[PDB]
Design a protein around this ligand. Structure first.
Ligand SMILES: CCCCCCCCCCCCCCCCCC(=O)OC[C@H](CO[C@@H]1O[C@H](CO[C@H]2O[C@H](CO)[C@H](O)[C@H](O)[C@H]2O)[C@H](O)[C@H](O)[C@H]1O)OC(=O)CCCCCCCCCCCCCCCCC
Ligand code: CLA
Ligand code: CLA
Ligand code: CLA
Ligand code: CLA
Ligand SMILES: CCCCCCCCCCCCCCCCCC(=O)OC[C@H](CO[C@@H]1O[C@H](CO)[C@H](O)[C@H](O)[C@H]1O)OC(=O)CCCCCCCCCCCCCCCCC
Ligand SMILES: CC1=C(/C=C/C(C)=C/C=C/C(C)=C/C=C/C=C(C)/C=C/C=C(C)/C=C/C2=C(C)CCCC2(C)C)C(C)(C)CCC1
Ligand SMILES: CC1=C(/C=C/C(C)=C/C=C/C(C)=C/C=C/C=C(C)/C=C/C=C(C)/C=C/C2=C(C)CCCC2(C)C)C(C)(C)CCC1
Ligand SMILES: CC1=C(/C=C/C(C)=C/C=C/C(C)=C/C=C/C=C(C)/C=C/C=C(C)/C=C/C2=C(C)CCCC2(C)C)C(C)(C)CCC1
Ligand SMILES: CC1=C(/C=C/C(C)=C\C=CC(/C)=C/C=C/C=C(C)/C=C\C=C(C)/C=C/C2=C(C)CCCC2(C)C)C(C)(C)CCC1
Ligand SMILES: CCCCCCCCCCCCO[C@@H]1O[C@H](CO)[C@@H](O[C@H]2O[C@H](CO)[C@@H](O)[C@H](O)[C@H]2O)[C@H](O)[C@H]1O
Ligand SMILES: CCCCCCCCCCCCO[C@@H]1O[C@H](CO)[C@@H](O[C@H]2O[C@H](CO)[C@@H](O)[C@H](O)[C@H]2O)[C@H](O)[C@H]1O
Ligand code: OEX
Ligand SMILES: [Ca+2]
Ligand SMILES: [Cl-]
Ligand SMILES: [Cl-]
Ligand SMILES: [Fe+2]
Lengths: 334, 37, 60, 78, 450, 39, 35, 341, 32
């Protein structure tokens, strides 16, 4: 009726090709801003003094990077955790030199992904669905927040956020392992179980459904054409799949309830990723992985090495080389 | 440490804080006794 | 000084007997006629033991 | 849905199972215990005792280097 | 109410959902759980007292509750030396006994007390849709919360004071005689940017601000409590919110997630409400301390630390912040917003002052910097202190690390719980929390997208 | 107990679970004592 | 009713559980070795 | 009835643990591999092969025990108990790392047996054998990593050790020496694994949140029946949701589940190809253009070059302890390191 | 010494307490 009411019905409309919604009213601008700035910076940003030592790092394609080595470089260590929008730079060149694009892209991206999760809830509400797809999506959101915001907060600088690049990601991981022994952190082990097991369960579920497909096609056409979109009947024989799997391992380890099976499929990777996100978020406060360096002594008192000691040697090798000009004092506390 | 008069119950205070974990476990014991109705 | 030790050990013993008895008595509606007065008496005696422990703290 | 065998819950809730196993299970437990605590495991597997990682003549890691005569190599390592 | 799946519709693993409409049983659950909280407070306090070596610093002994009592001004003197161990014991004992009482009441209500309270009393009986009654419970609890804030104020002002790490003459327990009631300061804290150098409310740096803000909080809470006792929700609130027990739970979950995140940040950064005397240094403090320690050492060796340039060309010991302030050099440049009682005496209007650095450094500052540098909040999960490549002989993890990590994790999972319950409350209010109705599946009546 | 001739399965579960908890507790204790304790 | 006692399932159960309990006893004993 | 048919009947009886013909290979080999790992991690040292304690008996824990690779002196000898090295001496066989090939070879034949079991059971119950095809991925990983990589290298010593920290060591070794993260085949593996986890999570959640109202309980789990003919969740609603949220959506259930098979399996196969490359030191170690520019331009710095520096540090600091048979003696002054660290 | 002995005594008594409550209620016919 009223103009505002009409606008409300448009934004919350389920007939839009892309659902907008109220969370979308924030998601779309912030995500577009982040995407445009990211593309521009990745192509053409000038080098960024990430470590705050006047040692600029070239991240963009036009300054000699390929796709693998290119990145949007985290803002300068001199900035620390200070807010550095464009309007606090003396010029655009200064803003670029100090890594302002990283802050712009990251802040907009984070707002965008939280609004994406809210938008998932919103559309589920408009369509009469159950509301918990956004809960599953909260796992990747938690991980991204850990690596882009929480870890820089705990470490005290956005220069210690994950770079927006492939090789930058690897650098982040290697330094992280050198400083926190993330491999020996049980939450990262749970994350590995989450992703290995999620892939395992994806492979099993897909293979068991594909294995039990009901015959509806000929040997020529794709078996995919045996399923018609919106058909009421089941397209595979879950009882045959259960018979096969319960004989592969044993009867009582096999799901015969599709609903319990799909809940398990949702829950395993999501929980694993929640745990690994919390692992990164707590290593942000330097509660690190297990330290068994020199845990085994012989009777005299000489250290007997274990694989943990070899791992520590690798960590030290990474530790002494990283950011080779940035440290003045013996302990890497910052 | 505990005031001198109390250090004979020192090995009891050593185990007190962990009790609520036992409460959480006891919930499952009770549900198991009723057959998880 | 040994009286304080005895009182505190008695208080721990009575805490154990209360911790056992209270949930059973509250969850046995048939035996509520004789377990409600026992609950009253036990709560009173437990409070008495706590008060005695508190006084002997300053007396020892 | 039973493939023929007795259900596990029935077996493990029965008195006879527990008369058997209140003995069998502890005996294997203390058999493994005695395997460790008598020093049998050290000698069987060749694992050094805490005082035998190094000897009064070998202060370095006894890393094997010879391709075929490892028995003599280990003996000279002590 | 039923106690199984057929009669409730909830499995055992969601059994507490069976309590949603059994107000007496729900009250019992809440009271017993409160008993659990108070029990942990008392038992952990007694454990910490028993495992307390009172001449060693609190943060060296894995203590998280005793620092809270010490900050309140109990059992400590100048620099945080533990004078009397008895008050810690008293706090623990009182919490333990009261937990016994609370557990007794929670058990009574959960097991024998009336199932529902509405036919027993209008005052305690409630319905989730009864907006006036829900706001009444809000009002009562707001009055209580304001009273607790005023209890903090009364302790700081009339009952011996609180520990002031910024006290002249050394950090000490002092009585706050002039809390800042000026609403400009108090509520301008809420407007400060949550970024480096501003620190939205984490930057509160003097007990006068803390106590004055608590006076304001007490007044706000009590007045809001009265306001909610005497009114009902307005039309806009009624049209905007879901009015159900699970909805109220979800609202509280969101609030709790926010508070958990705030507390983790607060303990990580703030050294006023969390004095380093009891909680150890912040990470920023330890980094700055290392820079100071080597400035002092090298200056004693004869280095002219004002003019010594490092390998990159920046000053090794001193440099400028991006706004020009004189700050410690090295990686600790990121931590130049740090303020601490041991370092501010060497700070001039422009930042670190060369004259003070060259002739005003006291031996106690050197000792404090060495201690803070060596107790940096870095440690392994199995409590091996120092950087992760260090060897096993230093058993230390900062209490700040424990508190910050734990409460960030709890904040995150309570955000997850808020999402879960908010979505469920919406779906249940709209009536599709049990799945799509085949007859009236909404998408079947929608135009195709393309 | 409540029925004659058999043990309730929940009692068996409680006993086995307590045994398992004790085994893991012994292993965690040994992480701090004897070999492998860094002392 | 009146099932066989020994089966393939019995053997599969014991082939695992028996050395498992033996090994657990061994590791428990290791918890008390002193250097 | 011939004896072969009678045996076939007995092997394929419906029992709690199906045996089959494949069981003759699977169960003894799998039991050997598992028991060998358990025995080695509980009792067996790596003192003579690596100079490391790697068993519970030596004081190591779950994270630090391993069945360590054999000594580098043996090259790729299969290290039979009766072989020329151990010569039938069980104690010596344990001490030289004979348990590693024992576990690796018995595990390889156990994996073969398990996939043959997948084929056999699929054939018996009358379904398509796509589970075995999916399992080919883990087999490719095991073959490449535990056999082909050490076979291309100097010896079994450089195979991953069967242990948690042993695997971690292998991972960091491959980063520092091979720059394995830079390898495009590894990146396709990572894409496949993370995509498989994503598909698992998103499919499970989508199904659970588009369920039909088929019961009256809040507990939606018992509103399903395995013999029901109709779909338990709304594919149409799921498709609309994902089309409006993400832009695109599955509309074919069969394609969806084949994709869930396809993604992680292809990831595993691509990563195995990359590992085969690393077996011959055919690495994606460097970008030569950036190396040359950095060598002539001391102001050119990228994340790639920083990672190269990290690898150099790891190699120099790790090699003496990781490769004790080499007797690497790197004096303190030759170790690379940044300032103050 | 005796500290682990007394500690395990208190721990075992506490551990038995909850199951003792559940067992007694189950055997005597209490509400569960
Ligand atoms: C609905 C509402 C949504 C609201 C959105 C608005 C944005 C929120 C997030 C803000 C992001 C801040 C980034 C930088 C944080 C920072 O610079 O630092 C943290 C700041 C504190 O700021 C610090 O405050 C400090 C105050 O200490 C100062 O004062 C002290 C006094 O004792 C000491 O003296 C100390 O030495 C001295 O430096 C300093 O000023 C530091 O320089 C300053 O950085 O926290 C703060 O202000 C605010 C508290 C932050 C909470 C932590 C984030 C929670 C994230 C959860 C993600 C979950 C996701 C789940 C998904 C699924
Ligand atoms: C005050 C906070 C609060 C309250 C009152 C509730 C209340 C409720 N929740 Mg809920 N929830 C919360 C926070 C809360 N939740 C948070 C923070 C999360 C995110 C994880 C959730 C996620 C959640 C889900 C997914 C569900 C509920 C559900 C429910 C309802 C029934 C749950 C039940 O029976 O418990 C049963 C208790 C258990 C089954 C035991 C769980 C043990 C957990 C998983 C591990 C504990 C770890 C802990 C840290 C200790 C570590 C132990 C270690 C030593 C090994 C109930 C009304 C259900 C519902 O929606 O009802 C309609 C349901 O499906 N909640
Ligand atoms: C803080 C944790 C907590 C609390 C306060 C409650 C509380 C409650 N739950 Mg619950 N629950 C929990 C966790 C909790 N639960 C968890 C983790 C699970 C998953 C396993 C469940 C699953 C569950 C189900 C399936 C059900 C409940 C139900 C209930 C209610 C009825 C209790 C009952 O009759 O059982 C009786 C149990 C006993 C009589 C055994 C003894 C219990 C007492 C209290 C033990 C106290 C021992 C203590 C040490 C003694 C000290 C006494 C004193 C001296 C201090 C009640 C208010 C029921 C309900 O909703 O009612 C409608 C219901 O059906 N819960
Ligand atoms: C928030 C916690 C809480 C709430 C809302 C209730 C609510 C209720 N209780 Mg319960 N109770 C509790 C905790 C609670 N109780 C605890 C911890 C115990 C153990 C001691 C009990 C033991 C108990 C028993 C045995 C009975 C009840 C009963 C009742 C019902 C009637 C109340 C009444 O009119 O009596 C009168 C209320 C008063 C005379 C007001 C007295 C207020 C207290 C006692 C004085 C202290 C006030 C204090 C300064 C305020 C702040 C507290 C402080 C700790 C911060 C009512 C619904 C009765 C019932 O269910 O009827 C059949 C019943 O028989 N309660
Ligand atoms: C736990 C304490 C508590 C709780 C649960 C409530 C709950 C409620 N109050 Mg409230 N209130 C409280 C304390 C509390 N109050 C106190 C202490 C006071 C005294 C100052 C008041 C004074 C008050 C008034 C005047 C009114 C309420 C009203 C309400 C009702 C609806 C308001 C609403 O939607 O909230 C949410 C708020 C909004 C939807 C407005 C948006 C606010 C901004 C835009 C959100 C941005 C927050 C930002 C991200 C956080 C940054 C922190 C800081 C920097 C600002 C609701 C049931 C309304 C009512 O119906 O009265 C009967 C109402 O008119 N209260
Ligand atoms: C139910 C409610 C139960 C109890 C309510 C609290 C009662 C606290 C009363 C004790 C106050 C001290 C009296 C003697 C004295 O003056 O101080 C003696 C000492 C030291 O306190 C000193 O008091 C002096 C008074 O002039 C000066 O102010 C000194 O500066 C000050 O240090 O205080 C103590 O040792 C007692 C510790 C106080 C802690 C009590 C708070 C927590 C109590 C209960 C929590 C229970 C929660 C259950 C839920
Ligand atoms: C409902 C329910 C539940 C819950 C329950 C609860 C939650 C509870 C509780 C409770 C409580 C919460 C309690 C308590 C208690 C306490 C006590 C019992 C005490 C005491 C005391 C004492 C005895 C002390 C002593 C001492 C002193 C005095 C000082 C010195 C030291 C000592 C310690 C010696 C469950 C889940 C199970 C399930 C079923 C239902
Ligand atoms: C004590 C202290 C202080 C003080 C403080 C204060 C005074 C405070 C406060 C505070 C406050 C006073 C607050 C607040 C808040 C708010 C919130 C948190 C909100 C919100 C919101 C919401 C939640 C909403 C929602 C919604 C929307 C969005 C729309 C639609 C509807 C709804 C409802 C859904 C200081 C710092 C000075 C010092 C220190 C201490
Ligand atoms: C070497 C060798 C061999 C083989 C052997 C075998 C085959 C055996 C075995 C064996 C075995 C087969 C053993 C076993 C074992 C075991 C163990 C050591 C166990 C364990 C465990 C645990 C520790 C667990 C725990 C837990 C958890 C963690 C979860 C839940 C709870 C429970 C408790 C279950 C022969 C002589 C032929 C030849 C030469 C070489
Ligand atoms: C303060 C105090 C006290 C108190 C105490 C209390 C407060 C109580 C209690 C108590 C309790 C609270 C106890 C408990 C418990 C428990 C348990 C021991 C549990 C469990 C377990 C298990 C092992 C389970 C298992 C399972 C599961 C979970 C799964 C499935 C099912 C089944 C069942 C198998 C006393 C008197 C000492 C004295 C004085 C001091
Ligand atoms: C060492 C031997 C092996 C140890 C095994 C330990 C695990 C054994 C199971 C742990 C306990 C599980 O507890 C099991 O829960 C099921 C749920 O189906 C319930 O099952 C039972 O419920 C009630 C018992 O009151 C009966 O009336 C019912 O007919 C029966 O199904 C029981 O409470 C118990 O049988
Ligand atoms: C599916 C197939 C599985 C294949 C593996 C199955 C287990 C096979 C184990 C074979 C072990 C061979 O073990 C080998 O036995 C021979 C014969 O006794 C021993 O030989 C020993 O006795 C013989 C005669 O008695 C002497 O000539 C010889 O000098 C002496 O060493 C070897 O020292 C030992 O190494
Ligand atoms: O920035 Mn990037 O990593 Ca975090 O540790 Mn200190 O800070 Mn630097 O040094 Mn190592
Ligand atoms: Ca003690
Ligand atoms: Cl680097
Ligand atoms: Cl530095
Ligand atoms: Fe599916």
């Amino acid at each position: 009726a009223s103009l505002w009411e009409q606008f409300c019905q448009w934004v919350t409309s389920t007939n839009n090709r892309i659902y907008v919604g109220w969370f979308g009213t924030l998601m779309i601008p912030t995500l577009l801003t982040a995407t445009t700035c990211f593309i521009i910076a990745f192509i053409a940003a000038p080098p960024v003094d990430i470590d705050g030592i006047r040692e600029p790092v070239a991240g963009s394609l036009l300054y000699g990077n390929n796709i693998i080595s290119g990145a949007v470089v985290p803002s300068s260590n001199a900035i620390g955790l200070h807010f550095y929008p464009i309007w606090e730079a003396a010029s655009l060149d200064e803003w670029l030199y100090n890594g302002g694009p990283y802050q712009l892209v990251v802040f907009h991206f984070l707002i965008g992904i939280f609004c994406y999760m809210g938008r998932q809830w919103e559309l589920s509400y408009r369509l009469g669905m159950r509301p918990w797809i956004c809960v599953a999506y909260s796992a990747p959101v938690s991980a991204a927040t850990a690596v882009f915001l929480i870890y820089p907060i705990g470490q005290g600088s956005f220069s210690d956020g994950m770079p927006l690049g492939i090789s930058g990601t690897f650098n982040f991981m290697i330094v992280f392992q050198a400083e926190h022994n993330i491999l020996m952190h049980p939450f990262h082990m749970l994350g590995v179980a989450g992703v290995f097991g999620g892939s395992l369960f994806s492979a099993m579920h897909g293979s068991l459904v594909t294995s039990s497909l009901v015959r509806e096609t000929t040997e020529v056409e794709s078996q995919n054409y045996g399923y018609k979109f919106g058909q009421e009947e089941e397209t595979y024989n879950i009882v045959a799949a259960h018979g096969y799997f319960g004989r592969l391992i044993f009867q009582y380890a096999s799901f015969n309830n599709s609903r319990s099976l799909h809940f398990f499929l949702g829950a395993w990777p999501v929980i694993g990723i929640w745990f690994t996100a919390m692992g990164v978020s707590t290593m942000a406060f330097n509660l690190n992985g297990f330290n068994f360096n020199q845990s085994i002594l012989d009777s005299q008192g000489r250290v007997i090495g274990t694989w943990a000691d070899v791992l520590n040697r690798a960590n030290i090798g990474f530790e002494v080389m990283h950011e080779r000009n940035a440290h003045n004092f013996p302990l890497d506390l910052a | 440490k505990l005031p001198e008069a109390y250090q004979i119950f020192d090995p009891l205070v050593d185990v007190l804080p962990v009790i609520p974990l036992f409460f959480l476990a006891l919930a499952f014991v009770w549900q198991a006794a009723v057959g998880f109705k | 000084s040994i009286v304080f030790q005895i009182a505190l050990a008695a208080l721990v013993l009575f805490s154990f007997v209360m911790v056992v008895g209270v949930p059973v008595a509250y969850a046995s509606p048939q035996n509520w006629d004789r377990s409600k007065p026992l609950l009253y008496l036990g709560s009173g005696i437990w409070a008495i033991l706590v008060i005695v422990v508190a006084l002997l703290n300053f007396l020892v | 849905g039973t493939t023929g065998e007795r259900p596990f819950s029935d077996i493990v809730t029965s008195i006879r199972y527990w008369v058997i196993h209140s003995i069998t299970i502890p005996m294997l437990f203390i058999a493994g215990w005695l395997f460790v605590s008598t020093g049998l495991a050290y000698d069987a597997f060749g694992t050094p005792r805490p005082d035998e990682y190094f000897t009064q003549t070998r202060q370095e890691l006894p890393i094997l280097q010879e391709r075929y005569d490892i028995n003599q190599e280990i003996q000279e390592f002590n | 109410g039923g106690r199984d799946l057929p009669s409730t519709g909830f499995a055992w693993w969601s059994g507490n959902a069976r309590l949603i409409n059994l107000s007496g049983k729900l009250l019992g659950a809440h009271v017993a759980h409160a008993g659990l909280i108070v029990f942990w407070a008392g038992a952990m306090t007694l454990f910490e007292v028993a495992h307390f070596i009172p001449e060693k610093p609190m943060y060296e002994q894995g203590l998280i509750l005793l620092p809270h009592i010490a900050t309140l001004g109990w059992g400590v003197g100048p620099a945080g030396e533990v004078t009397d161990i008895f008050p810690f014991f008293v706090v623990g004992v009182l919490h333990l006994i009261s937990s016994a009482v609370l557990g007794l009441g929670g058990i009574y209500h959960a097991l024998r007390g009336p199932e529902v309270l509405e036919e027993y009393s209008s005052f305690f009986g409630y319905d989730w849709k009864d907006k006036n009654q829900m706001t009444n419970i809000i009002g009562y609890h707001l009055i209580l919360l304001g009273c607790g804030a005023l209890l903090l104020v009364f302790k700081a002002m009339f009952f011996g004071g609180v520990y002031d790490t910024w006290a002249p003459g050394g950090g000490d327990v002092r009585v706050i005689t002039n809390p800042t009631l000026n609403p400009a300061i108090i509520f301008g804290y809420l407007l400060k940017a949550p970024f480096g150098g501003e620190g939205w409310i984490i930057s509160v740096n003097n007990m006068e601000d803390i106590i004055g803000g608590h006076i304001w909080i007490g007044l706000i809470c009590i007045s809001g409590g009265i306001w909610h006792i005497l009114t009902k929700p307005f039309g806009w609130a009624r049209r905007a919110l879901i009015w159900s027990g699970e909805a109220y739970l979800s609202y509280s979950l969101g609030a709790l997630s926010l508070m958990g995140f705030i507390a983790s940040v607060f303990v990580w950064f703030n050294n006023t409400a969390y004095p380093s005397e009891f909680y150890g240094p912040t990470g920023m403090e330890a980094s700055q301390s290392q820079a100071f320690t080597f400035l002092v050492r090298d200056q004693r060796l004869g280095a002219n630390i004002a003019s010594a340039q490092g390998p990159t060309g920046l000053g090794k010991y001193l440099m400028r912040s991006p706004s020009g302030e004189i700050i410690f050099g090295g990686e600790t440049m990121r931590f130049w917003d740090f303020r601490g009682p041991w370092l501010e005496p060497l700070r001039g209007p422009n930042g670190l002052d060369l004259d003070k650095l060259r002739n005003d450094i006291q031996p106690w500052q050197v000792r404090r910097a060495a201690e803070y540098m060596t107790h940096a909040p870095l440690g392994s999960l199995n409590s091996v202190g120092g950087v992760i490549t260090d060897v096993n002989s230093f058993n230390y993890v900062s209490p700040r690390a424990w508190l910050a990590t734990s409460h960030f994790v709890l904040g995150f999972f309570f955000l997850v719980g808020h999402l879960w319950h908010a979505g469920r409350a919406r779906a249940a209010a709209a009536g599709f929390e049990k799945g799509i109705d085949r007859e009236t599946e909404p998408t079947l009546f929608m135009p195709d997208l393309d | 107990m409540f029925a004659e001739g058999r043990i309730p399965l929940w009692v068996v579960g409680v006993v086995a679970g307590i045994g398992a908890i004790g085994v893991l507790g012994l292993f965690f204790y040994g992480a701090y004592a004897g070999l492998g304790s860094s002392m | 009713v009146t099932y066989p006692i020994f089966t393939v399932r019995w053997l599969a159960v014991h082939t695992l559980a028996v050395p498992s309990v033996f090994f657990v006893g061994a590791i428990a004993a290791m918890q008390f070795i002193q250097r | 009835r011939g004896w072969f048919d009678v045996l076939d009947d007995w092997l394929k009886r419906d029992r709690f643990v199906f045996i089959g013909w494949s069981g003759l290979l699977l169960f003894p080999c799998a039991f050997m591999a598992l028991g060998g790992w358990l025995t080695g991690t509980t009792f067996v040292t790596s003192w003579y092969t690596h100079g490391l304690a790697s068993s519970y008996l030596e004081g190591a824990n779950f994270l630090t025990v391993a069945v360590s690779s054999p000594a580098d002196a043996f090259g790729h000898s299969l290290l039979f108990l009766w072989g020329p090295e151990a010569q039938g001496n069980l104690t010596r066989w344990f001490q030289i790392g004979g348990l590693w090939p024992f576990v690796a070879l018995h595990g390889a034949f156990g994996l073969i047996g398990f996939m043959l079991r997948q084929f056999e059971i699929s054939r018996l119950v009358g379904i398509r054998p796509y589970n075995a095809i999916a399992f080919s991925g883990p087999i490719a990983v095991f073959v490449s990593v535990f056999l082909m990589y050490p076979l291309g290298q100097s010896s079994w010593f450089f195979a991953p050790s069967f242990g948690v920290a042993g695997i971690f060591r292998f991972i960091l070794f491959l980063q520092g020496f091979h720059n394995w993260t830079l390898n495009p085949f590894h990146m396709m593996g990572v894409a496949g694994i993370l995509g498989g986890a994503l598909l698992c999570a998103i499919h499970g959640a989508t199904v659970e949140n588009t369920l039909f109202e088929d019961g009256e309980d809040s507990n939606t789990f018992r509103a399903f029946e395995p013999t029901q003919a109709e779909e338990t969740y709304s594919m149409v609603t799921a498709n609309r949701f994902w089309s409006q949220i993400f832009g695109i959506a599955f509309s074919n259930k069969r394609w969806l589940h084949f994709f869930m098979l396809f993604v992680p399996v292809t990831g595993l196969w691509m990563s195995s190809v990359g590992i085969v490359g690393l077996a011959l030191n055919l690495r994606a170690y460097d970008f030569v253009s950036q190396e040359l520019r950095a060598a002539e331009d001391p102001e050119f710095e990228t994340f790639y070059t920083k990672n190269i520096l990290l690898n150099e540090g790891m190699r120099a600091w790790m090699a003496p302890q990781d490769q004790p048979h080499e007797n690497f003696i790197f004096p303190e002054e030759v170790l690379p390191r940044g300032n103050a660290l | 010494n005796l500290e682990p002995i007394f500690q395990l005594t208190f721990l075992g008594l506490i551990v038995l307490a909850g199951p003792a409550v559940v067992f007694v209620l189950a055997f005597r016919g209490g509400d569960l």
